[PDB]
Amino acid sequence: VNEEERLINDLLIVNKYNKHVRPVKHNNEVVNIALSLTLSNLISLKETDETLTTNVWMDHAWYDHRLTWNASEYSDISILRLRPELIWIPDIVLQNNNDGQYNVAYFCNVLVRPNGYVTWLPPAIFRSSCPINVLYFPFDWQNCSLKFTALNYNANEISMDLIIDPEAFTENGEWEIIHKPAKKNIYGDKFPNGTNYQDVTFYLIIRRKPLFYVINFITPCVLISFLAALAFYLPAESGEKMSTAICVLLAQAVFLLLTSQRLPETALAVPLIGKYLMFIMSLVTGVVVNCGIVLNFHFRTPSTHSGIDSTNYIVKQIKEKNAYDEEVGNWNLVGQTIDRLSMFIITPVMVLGTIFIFVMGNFNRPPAK
Amino acid sequence: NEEGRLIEKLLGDYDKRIKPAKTLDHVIDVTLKLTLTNLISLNEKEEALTTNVWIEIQWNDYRLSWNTSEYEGIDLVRIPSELLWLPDVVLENNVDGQFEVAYYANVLVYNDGSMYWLPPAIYRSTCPIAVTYFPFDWQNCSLVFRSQTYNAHEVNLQLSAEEGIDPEDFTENGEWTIRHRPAKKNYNWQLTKDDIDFQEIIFFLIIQRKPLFYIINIIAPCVLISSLVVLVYFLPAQAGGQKCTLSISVLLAQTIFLFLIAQKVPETSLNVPLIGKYLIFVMFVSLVIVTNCVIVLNVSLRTPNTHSCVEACNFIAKSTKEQNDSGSENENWVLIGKVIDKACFWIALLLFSLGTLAIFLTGHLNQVPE
Amino acid sequence: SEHETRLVANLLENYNKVIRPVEHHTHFVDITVGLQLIQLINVDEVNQIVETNVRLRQQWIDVRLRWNPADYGGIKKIRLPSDDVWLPDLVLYNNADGDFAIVHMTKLLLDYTGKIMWTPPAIFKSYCEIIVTHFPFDQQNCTMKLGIWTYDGTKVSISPESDRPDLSTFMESGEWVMKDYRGWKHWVYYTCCPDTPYLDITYHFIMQRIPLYFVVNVIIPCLLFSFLTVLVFYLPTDSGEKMTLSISVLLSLTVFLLVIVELIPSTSSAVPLIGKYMLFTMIFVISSIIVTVVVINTHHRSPSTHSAIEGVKYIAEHMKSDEESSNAAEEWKYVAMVIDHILLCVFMLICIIGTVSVFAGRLIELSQEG
Amino acid sequence: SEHETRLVANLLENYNKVIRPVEHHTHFVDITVGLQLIQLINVDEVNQIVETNVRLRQQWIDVRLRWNPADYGGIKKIRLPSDDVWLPDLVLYNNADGDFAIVHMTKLLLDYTGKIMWTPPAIFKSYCEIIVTHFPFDQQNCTMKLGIWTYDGTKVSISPESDRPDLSTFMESGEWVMKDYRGWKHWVYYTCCPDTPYLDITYHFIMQRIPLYFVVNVIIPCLLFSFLTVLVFYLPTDSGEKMTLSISVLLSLTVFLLVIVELIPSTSSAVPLIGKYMLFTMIFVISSIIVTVVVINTHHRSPSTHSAIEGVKYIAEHMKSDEESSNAAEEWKYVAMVIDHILLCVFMLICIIGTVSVFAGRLIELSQEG
Amino acid sequence: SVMEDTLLSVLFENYNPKVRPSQTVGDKVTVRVGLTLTSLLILNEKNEEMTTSVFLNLAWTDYRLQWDPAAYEGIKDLSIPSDDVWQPDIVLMNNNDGSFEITLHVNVLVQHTGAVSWHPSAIYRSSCTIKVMYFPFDWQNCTMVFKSYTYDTSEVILQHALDAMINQDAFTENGQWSIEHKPSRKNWRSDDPSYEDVTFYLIIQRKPLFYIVYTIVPCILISILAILVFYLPPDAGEKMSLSISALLALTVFLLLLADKVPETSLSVPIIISYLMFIMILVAFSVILSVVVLNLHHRSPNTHEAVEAIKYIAEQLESASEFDDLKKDWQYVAMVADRLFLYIFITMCSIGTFSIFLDASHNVPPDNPFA
């Protein structure tokens, strides 16, 4: 009763307090407002289109000079509640990531300190278009930049001063959070003739990539490669499996094509760089080429691919004669070339196969640099 | 005729949230009924549906019988939603989605205090169709709905025919069919042990489906398939030597086709409901097709290999002839096709049996529930 | 000035928005509908759903809105916002799948006399017949009824306004094409009740479907397959050396036909085409089936094909001769005389089936094209 | 009558709902909460989403609701509209994926004393771990914590009430099965702040998953593919004359299972499981590859099997003798002996690594079964 | 103090919220409209759908809000929620395919003598004619017409900033496309009394070069096996059968390609160009491989006494080798050479043609960037 009825009638929040009027002690420098950013969770990542759905605790602070109470308000309880419509609430806009209005971080219950200072901090399910670019894929995986602040007010109606991103990074993400710096600021611009709205700039530098696609995807390559590798070992052990060897090309071919087909599918869902996508398709082509090589190299050669005396001489004639045919073929066989073929298949597989993990490394060394 | 004064009189005392209950020990007389008009989504595997229900709402409140200036003026009045007792409807077992356009609509106040109202509602629900509803015998869809607010000691719902229909406006583009709709008006006491009964509205819907389109897509391929394998089976007796592998090419082709089927329609049942009986005949008549199929190669696998100076030399050459003959003889005792020919008739009648077992039984699982 | 404030305030005070301009017990509130689809955004024949542009021309009179020199004298006709107006609960009968979009908080015009128009720029969600009879070449007429939703011909009546085509603003991006559309009025009294019920505008959409791209891709792999099967006929009679070689094709091609089946039924499921369309493919595709199985079983149909010194010479020559015999036997197996028969046997068959497939194709194309 | 107007008017004036029945600087507001779960309409193991219904049994007290002969006297227990109540922003800590639905606009239980309860038939979408360890045979316990949202201990406190199972009303149509469900309370103060924070109810759902559908089809193609592999090994003995044929079936086989693994990734990522599982299939099947690698590589492992008149009689039989020892050479390689070791070598090794697959598989379920 | 309460009061005493800052029917209020684009997020180039985001900077003058000592001279600039001024309920004649997000109901910047500044960023669902003509290198332009959806230009005039401002001013860096220029022209179609919409031109250029690359490889790599199958005949005539295997293989491959192409344009289609001729290029390799297949088919076969025995021997061998020598005369390799070089002409001609068209397509239809 300590003037309580009278006093909250004095404040009348809505009626006596100007909620449509922001208590910035009138036209001056600004109401000292401060924002605090704490991610509570990251539910979805879209690397390809630079869009992220993430939850944040919108911790907000500013002193409501008309909020200061007396005994039957202040001291009656040095802390009490008052809804959004009865509390000045900063119009915090997610500067480059609010291209998706904020949810339940809107007009929510706020905390009333005793001497005007107020505290409003609810949950924000939001969507953002963070600095992915086609450079959010090299190993550094860029730095996702975001700015928060009270949209409406300027530098003479609002001043917002300034937590790791992995503090509530989602563990079900296909990426890795390496760092998350936080520093506020204020800034005018060229077309504006005055300074204004201060903001929470929070850069998130992350990284991502599976250690799983590598598993089932290179797996078939050394397996498949041994087929093409054996392909050339097999032309020796038994090149006579002509048609059947041919079958395997169809078969290793259809395998190759849609394998690449699964590749862009996951690709579009992921902006993949040009550097990596080529080593994949470049090398399967390496075999594709050698499958075509397989073709020709496997089917490439033009062919390998006194009366009684009179009569039997006829046969010795037919004898020798087609013995020339028979041999016209082994002429083509080309067998002392055999090992060199599969030797100069080994050498190149070694060259290229190495060239890749050689390149793997020559770029694996400098990032680790 | 006091038209102005009357309106202004009751509105003075007019009470919103209070029920037109004479007193408190005998509840009010509430009438309800539903005419189906749209069965928008049948996801039986998850047991849920969406329907535009005519929520026929009716009750009594003479709290406003009028005089010459309103009752007599016109025995009919259309007064706004928010202006009289409103049953917040929902289906106990079904309504899984708050009603849409089922409320906030113009009600009807005759002149004696009779109240009539009927908004249309598209909403979600969950009726049976629990590992059954795909047979030929149908699981009766049982939906009971009532106000989810107060309980029958103040509120009382009424109904009508429990014998007469869901097919009243059952959708013609449904992959199913209805044969009866029974409905009972009842009290509240369930398995869960709730008392103070709030009456509800039971909605039986035993309906049929299965108007197969996929049937003959399944029936002709299998016959073509069976024949294809019976090609594999009889074609060998007709086919040349370069046919053993010929037959193989078919196995490869035969099952490429097979599991592709195994991938096709399995998808079918996941997006829609499911049931194992019809499922059993297919995969196992299918596994037997596969069985005797690979059996065939194991059959075209079985057999051992089918899978004076003058005369001294005339002597020995006449030998290569008899010698190799002994060899070609090998071929003989090996490829005298008793097993193969018979394998044709083996699968043949086995074919007839697998088929008869199945289509005869499909005859039954359509004929008992017929 | 001119009773300025007295003008404006008086008007607010004695005027109840919710009141319906009822005039004695008779004519009901005469209100007319007039829909002009400016354009259509998207449709799904399968799910029979359309999102369309509609400017609803709504007319009615409120003799309470008539004025003198202090309202009409101010400025003849003027702009008054909706709110204050009694909005007919307009509803597409067997349609209505969605709320009117941009019907709310718009404005209307009042004349020096009273007459009011409410014509807010709508676009909404629709629901009209398509049945499995819409994608036909012979189309179906989308039956769409419109009229007053919760008020009767005694409280109110929705009437029509004029004739106009549906292809007047038909979407050129539609996978369908229009024939004509007409709309005539009607009053629905039900044998139920002896009362005189609501009025209604009935739309009839007569349009035939199928964009032509589909046309080309599908019939050409058929004449494609026609040639391989054509080769399936000519390859054997002109060369039985690659019978098995074709074994391959038979596998590669029915599977081609199998996979084309996934693609076009989803088309089937993507767009509702009258099933009688399906039988085209049915026998057509399936003859590829019955013909093969016979053609290739027949292809397959053949047993195995798919002094003393002088005497020495004659026991040896005799050996070469009866195997001589043998060779001719298996060739007496794969003859080239009837493979020619099957060639013309079926090619006439194909030119029959084919021209028979072209038959009903051509025939109702003699009806559709008209 | 009985202070009629004086009693309800006074109640509205000096009564407030924004406020909470705080009673001195102590135990907070005595909130009694509990789960009454009777239906689980939809959940996805993959996304770990759960849309179920649980009536939120709340129980706490507000003396201000106490009364005398003019409210208690009227009718013992009276149920007040919930509005008058300070409703907590309750929410699923690591869950809460959805708004509670059906809690608004409801009934509140008031007593002569003040006791009050309100069990709302709340239905909502949730979000709790299932991870890849959700559906094993050995289960995972989804940690579900619930408690006040934006209010700290200094103002409101909740506590469990009773133990009740999760299977008390668990889904019998679930693709899973329950073992146990426990719920204990606690208050969480954080090292951050010296303050006394919110209270919460933590549920733990312990239940094993996985229907057997995926199971039946993983192993059928395995045994069936092991039949063709078994054929793979046996053929060279019974029909090595079809080694190439064998090749065809490996292109067959390979593509089939390479395609089998396609299904896996879709299904697996379409329905969650702990990777440790696919590891079984991985090597076991890479084993059929590793083995066909060696076995058919080994299968093809072999060089090419993969007077004077008296004189020419001698040049001639010479011609024959040279070639004869030569044909002996290709058979010199296909010794038909190691073919039997390879099927037995691997038949045992597949019977053993199969029995190995069989091993951890059954060991793990001799762990699950438990 | 200086009549502060007074001013303050009178203002709110007389100020009208729902009124237009103009006096009667005239030149109206000249509102300034100008949007600084943020960026764009999704171009559905296939249905011509556009979801972008920009700032809605509006500004005109409220000579009804000019203040005095304290709010005018006290603080020349003050922020105040909109909701109090006519707001362009702007829709887009083509676009505006959906509602406003961050567009209306937000605070505004109000200057001393009445200037009004409102700068809200928003996401808007639009639809511009990017038609199925968003892929030709010559691309096309579009009409983006913004304007209100209940107001008619009679009580306000709309006016723009630049017209060159550009749309690449805030073009999405995430766009697989690019832009040349954005024209801005003010419009008032006379088909409606209401002066209205403003047309904004998109001279868009979208060049995402990514998979047509490995699409080329098929065409050419498939050619590898193609030229190969055309090269394999005089390379390994025995290609005879293996050849057919190639085309099964070659055809399935191209048909799967047929599979990914329709489903990929499924979201970003435009002119056929690429497909038009690769469709021909398709038909080309298709038929070329099939007629070469018929090239392959055309072969009906390919696809004293002592001394007497001798003499009988002399004739045996020689006699039939001519017969098989006849087969040589029949399957010589004239055609293969000639058409493998007709293969030379065909494939290198049709090759350098689409090579050319494609060549001509990227360079020739490139400059219409306007």
Domains and CATH numbers, chain E: 4-205 (2.70.170.10), 212-366 (1.20.58.390)
Q: Which residues of E touch C327 (CB under 8 A)?
A: none
- HSE-up of residue B259 (Cα within 13 Å, Cβ side): 21
CB-based contact, E15 to chain A, within 8 Å: no
Chain C residues in contact with B115 by the CB 8 A cut-off are none
Give B302's contacts in chain D (Cβ within 8 Å).
238
Report CB contact under 8 Å: D256, B297. no
Q: Do A152 and A187 share a structural domain?
A: yes
Answer yes or no: do A248 and A165 share one domain: no
Q: Chain D contacts of A254, Cβ < 8 Å?
A: 255
Touch C-D: 3+ C-beta pairs under 8 A: no
> Is residue A168 located within the same domain as residue A21?
yes
**In angstroms, rounded to a whole number, what is the distance separating the alpha carbons of residues B122 and B99?**
7
Q: What is the DSSP string of E203-223?
A: -EE----SSHHHHHHIIIIIH
Side chain identity at residue C22, one-letter code: V
Residues A198 and A141 in one domain: yes
Domains of chain D with CATH codes: 17-209 (2.70.170.10), 213-301+336-368 (1.20.58.390)
Q: Is residue A175 domain-shared with residue A248, that is, in the same domain?
A: no
For the record, the structure tokens of B52 come out as 């535009």
Q: How far is C149 from chain E, CA to nearest CA, in Å? A: 25
Distance CA E336, CA A111 (A): 89
Residue the block writes with tokens 């498939």: E222
The β-bridge relationship of strands E143-148 and E90-92 is antiparallel
D312/A312 CB distance under 8 A: yes
Q: A204 and A229 share a domain?
A: no
- Last residue in a domain, options A208, A223, A245: A208
Which residues 103-162 on chain C approach chain B with CB closer than 8 angstroms?
Answer: 131-132, 150-151, 154-155
Is-contact D56 D120, C-beta < 8 A?
yes
Indicate yes or no: CB of C231 within 8 angstroms of CB of E293.
yes
Q: Chain D residues with CB inside 8 Å of B123's CB?
A: none
Q: Are residues A253 and A349 in the same domain?
A: yes
* Residue of B252, B266, B298 lying closest to D231 (CB–CB): B298
* Cβ-based burial of C362 (10 A; exposed 0-12, middle 13-18, buried ≥19): exposed
Contact A308 E237 (CB under 8 A): no
D115 — contact with chain A (CB < 8 Å)? no
Cβ-nearest to D173 among B131, B148, B150? B131
Closest CA to E271 of C40, C217, C213: C213
First to last CA, chain B: 67
Flag whether A305 is in a domain.
Answer: no
Distance from CA of C260 to the nearest CA of E (A): 9
Q: Which of E74, E174, E249 sits opposite A250 (nearest CB)?
A: E249
Measure the CA–CA gap between D276 and D281, rounded to whole angstroms: 10
Number of Cβ pairs < 8 A linking chain A and chain D: 69
Alpha carbon distances (Å) from D276 to B155, D96, D259: 58, 30, 21
| Domains observed in chain B | 3-209 (2.70.170.10), 215-367 (1.20.58.390)
- Residue B141 DSSP class: P
Q: Is A247's CB within 8 Å of D248's CB?
A: yes
Alpha-carbon distance of D197 to D187, in angstroms, equals 7
Are both A41 and A186 inside the same structural domain? Answer: yes
Burial tier of B119 (Cβ tally within 10 Å: 0-12, 13-18, 19+): buried
Q: Name which of E4, E78, E79 to mutate to probe chain A: the one with the most chain A Cβ atoms within 10 A of its Cβ.
A: E79
Distances in whole angstroms, Cα of residue D329 to Cα of each of D325, D334, E169, E300, E336: 7, 9, 81, 37, 38
Look at residues B156, B211, B149, B175 and name the one whose alpha carbon lies nearest to residue B31. Answer: B156
Enumerate the β-bridge partners of residue B206: B140, B180
**Contact residues for E8 (Cβ-Cβ < 8 A; gap 6+):** E70, E71
Closest alpha carbon within chain C to E295? C235
Give the residue on C whose Cα is nearest the Cα of B229: C293
Q: How far apart are CA A81 and CA A13, in angstroms?
A: 12
Which residues from C are below 8 Å from E297, CB to CB? 231, 234-235, 238-239
Give the domain extent around A222.
213-300+335-364
CA distance C42 to chain E (A): 10
Give B-chain residues touching D241 at CB under 8 angstroms: 244, 305, 307
CA–CA–CA angle A164, A165, A169 (5° rounding): 125
As a whole number of angstroms, the distance between CA B63 and CA B367 comes to: 59
Q: Which CATH number belongs to the domain containing residue A44 in this structure?
A: 2.70.170.10
Q: Which residues in chain C touch residue B252, judged by CB atoms under 8 angstroms apart? A: 251
Picking from A208, A241, A257, the residue at the C-terminal end of a domain is A208
Whether A191 and A255 share a structural domain = no
Structure tokens at E52: 């972008």
Q: Measured between CB atoms, does E362 come within 8 Å of chain C?
A: no
Please indicate whether, in this complex, the C-beta atoms of A312 and D251 are within 8 angstroms of each other: no
Do the Cβ atoms of A305 and E173 come within 8 Å? Answer: no
Q: Which residue of E has its CA nearest to A158?
A: E79
* Touch criterion met for B and C (3+ Cβ pairs within 8 Å): yes
Element spanning A341, H or E? helix A338-364
Name which of A132, A157, A311 is nearest E307 (Cβ-Cβ).
Answer: A311
Instruction: Tell me which residue in D244, D286, D301 faces A244 most closely, judged by beta carbons.
Output: D244
Cβ separation of A264 and E211 shorter than 8 Å?
Answer: yes
CA distances from C211 to C141, C175, E340 (A): 19, 5, 39
Residues 6+ apart with CB under 8 A from C282: B216
Give the number of C-E residue pairs with CB atoms closer than 8 Å. 83
Q: Is the domain of A163 the same as that of A201?
A: yes
Q: Which residue of C has its CA nearest to E307?
A: C310
Q: How far apart are CA E41 and CA C181, in angstroms?
A: 40
- Asked if residue A204 belongs to a domain, the reply is yes
How many helices and strands in chain D, by DSSP H and E? 7, 13
Domain final residue, candidates A178, A208, A238:
A208
DSSP A23-92: -SSSSSS--EEEEEEEEEEEEEEETTTTEEEEEEEEEEEEE-TTT---IIIIIT-S-EEE-GGGS----E
Please state whether beta strands E157-159 and E30-34 pair in parallel, antiparallel, or not at all (unpaired). Answer: parallel
**Which of B17, B48, B309 is facing D307, going by the closest CB pair?**
B309
- Taking the CA of residue E307 and the nearest CA in chain A, the distance in Å comes to 6
CB atoms within 10 A of CB E94: 20
Residue B183 φ then ψ, to 5°: -145, 130
CA distance B245 to D241: 10
Amino acid at C299: H
CA angle E226/E228/E232 to nearest 5° reads: 130
**C-beta atoms of E252 and C252 within 8 A:** yes
* D235/B130 Cβ within 8 A: no
Sequence-ordered list of residues with C-beta below 8 angstroms from that of A28, at least 6 positions apart, any chain: A156
Helices (H), chain B: 3-13, 215-238, 244-271, 277-299, 309-334, 338-355, 361-367
Tokens 């006596």 sit at which residue? A16
Sheet strands side by side (includes C176-187): C90-92, C140-148, C199-209, C176-187
Q: Which residues precede gaps in chain A, with C-N > 2.5 A? A: 162, 305
Cα–Cα distance, E258 to E235 (Å, whole number): 30
Same domain, A150 and A285: no
**Interface probe, candidates B39, B52, B55, B78, chain C, greatest C C-beta count within 10 A:** B78
Which D residues in the span 125-164 are in contact with A, Cβ-Cβ below 8 Å? Answer: 150, 154
* Contact residues on chain B for D244, CB-CB shorter than 8 A: 245
Query: According to the 3-state scheme, what is the secondary structure of E54-98?
Result: EECEEECECCCCCCCCCCCCCCCEEEEECCCCCCCCEEECCCCCC
The total domain count for chain A is: 2
Q: Which helix (H) or strand (E) holds A309?
A: helix A307-333
d(CA A232, CA A226): 9
Query: Residues 277 to 336 of E: which have CB under 8 A from any A CB?
Result: 306-307, 310-311, 313-314, 317
Residues C298 and C338: their CA atoms lie apart, in Å, by 10
Within 8 A of D150 by CB-CB distance, chain A residues are: 108-109, 122
The partner residue sitting opposite C247, judged by closest CB among B52, B73, B246, is B246
Question: In this structure, are A178 and A238 located in the same domain?
Answer: no
Residue A252, domain CATH: 1.20.58.390
CA B42 vs CA B94, B171, B269, C97, C290: distances in Å: 13, 11, 13, 17, 37
Which residues in chain B are contacts of C25 at CB distance < 8 A? 73-74
